[PDB]
Amino acid sequence: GPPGPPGPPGPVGPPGPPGPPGPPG
Amino acid sequence: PPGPPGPPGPVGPPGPPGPPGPPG
Amino acid sequence: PPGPPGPPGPPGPVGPPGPPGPPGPP
């Protein structure tokens, strides 16, 4: 028999890094 | 007789950076 | 007998954006 179909998508990736600091007051 | 579905793929990549912080 | 399992699926969605940065200096 032929191979089965592809598996499901993997899970959602991790959050990105924080943004840079805000502007001086 | 087809095989079963494959395994789940890899975790996605890290998200993009957040926005700049608040003014001081 | 059956075939072998299929290949892995694709990678998942990109992760969410990070949080806002820290405050600026006073």
Q: This structure's resolution (angstroms)?
A: 1.0
B6 vs C6, C11, C24, C25, CA distance in Å? Answer: 4, 13, 49, 52
Q: How close B7 comes to chain A (CA, Å)?
A: 5
Q: Phi first, then psi: give them for residue C15, nearest 5 degrees.
A: -65, 170
DSSP label of A8: -
For residues A1 and C2, is the Cβ–Cβ distance under 8 A?
A: yes
> Neighbours of A (≥3 Cβ pairs closer than 8 A)?
B, C
- Burial pattern B1-24, b for ≥16 Cβ within 10 A else e, equals eebebbebbeebeebebbebbeee
Picking from C14, B22, B20, the residue whose alpha carbon sits closest to that of residue A15 is: C14
Query: Is the Cβ pair C12, B15 closer than 8 Å?
Result: no
> Neighbours of C (≥3 Cβ pairs closer than 8 A)?
A, B
